[PDB]
Write a protein that binds this DNA or RNA. Sequence first.
DNA 1: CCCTCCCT
Lengths: 72, 71
Amino acid sequence: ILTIRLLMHGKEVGSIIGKKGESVKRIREESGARINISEGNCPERIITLTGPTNAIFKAFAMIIDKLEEDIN
Amino acid sequence: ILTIRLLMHGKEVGSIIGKKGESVKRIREESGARINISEGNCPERIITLTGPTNAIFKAFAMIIDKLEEDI
DNA sequence: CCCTCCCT
């Protein structure tokens, strides 16, 4: 059970929270991680990833994949 | 003693109970109304309010303010 | 693109 913080620009975050909140809703329900995204229109936002190794991995990889398809 | 039912989306209602449970704690205590909330992840939830016009009015106003800020 | 918040 480990935690890892990811830094993220404003626009970056919006992608992980696709219109209506589903994008996270997958990543969450699909990796098994505890995912939190500090709110408030702040230029830099933390996304905390919390859980066992593979859960993190999975959440990470989906996060990566989401941003990967946003260039630009 | 009046009963007034409030239809409420699943998102909204989660804000009234905000966190461990304290948001309702606040309103139950500080408004002095009989507040009930239907249970389970149903999209559509009822909040019954029983009491005097005062308590009903208090509770309601406390709800609106929890809602107003989200936003 | 803003997400969940579990109370008698």
